[PDB]
A paper describes a structure:
MEX‐3C, a novel RNA binding E3 ubiquitin ligases, contains two N‐terminal heterogeneous nuclear ribonucleoprotein K homology (KH) domains and C‐terminal Ring finger domain. It plays an essential role in the regulation of energy balance because its mutation moderates adiposity and develops energy cost. hMEX‐3C is a unique RNA binding ubiquitin E3 ligase and plays a key role in mRNA degradation, such as post‐transcriptional regulation of common Human leukocyte antigen serotype A2 (HLA‐A2) allotypes. Ubiquitination of Lys‐63 linked ubiquitin chains to RIG‐I by hMEX‐3C in stress granules is important for the activation of the IFNB promoter and RIG‐I‐mediated antiviral innate immunity. Ring finger domain is responsible for the ubiquitination reaction and defines the largest family of E3 ligases.
The Ring finger domain structure was refined in space group P1, with eight molecules per asymmetric unit. The Ring finger domain of hMEX‐3C forms stable dimer in solution as determined using size exclusion chromatography method. The core Ring finger domain adopts the typical Ring fold, consisting of two antiparallel β‐strands (β1 from Residues 618–621, and β2 from Residues 652–656) and one central α helix (α1 from Residues 630–638) [Fig. 1(b)]. It suggests that the two Zn2+ ions are very important to maintain the stability of the intact Ring finger domain structure and contribute to its E3 ligase activity. The cysteines/histidine (1st, 2nd, 5th, 6th) coordinate one cation and others (3rd, 4th, 7th, 8th) coordinate the second cation. Therefore, hMEX‐3C Ring finger domain belongs to the RING‐HC category, as determined by the consensus sequence [Fig. 1(a)]. Moreover, to analyze the roles of predicted interface residues, we mutated them to alanine, respectively. In the self‐ubiquitination assays, mutants of I610A, I636A, P645A, and Q648A abolished activity, while V609A and K639A reduced activity [Fig. 3(b)].
Numbering used by the authors:
A (entry chain B), B (entry chain A): 605 to 659
């Protein structure tokens, strides 16, 4: 429950659109979204939104 | 290992946007988007795209 690759504190629950990388908690994903130039920190693809993943 | 909830034949690979339901193979998710009133079969939310999820 500590597997977010950004903060390593929260649980992974979010994926970025459209690259689909599912490696982030929602707080870190939201922070990615309101950067000046939102982009995936892993693959650098531009980010248009973050979604919570439901499996 | 998870089975697509539509066909129960292929692995789960894709999620719908924006509801984030991650329960579909890419073929079944593509079929969802290509319909004329696209909506998630699980929660009935309108679907604006389907993406492959990378975990
Ligand atoms: Zn985080
Ligand atoms: Zn990415
Ligand atoms: Zn399927
Ligand atoms: Zn849904």
């Amino acid at each position: 429950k500590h597997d977010c690759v950004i903060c390593f504190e929260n649980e992974v629950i979010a994926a970025l659109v459209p690259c689909g990388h599912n490696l982030f908690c929602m707080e870190c994903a939201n922070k990615i979204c309101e950067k000046r130039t939102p982009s995936c920190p892993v693959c650098q693809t531009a980010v248009t939104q973050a979604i919570q993943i439901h499996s």
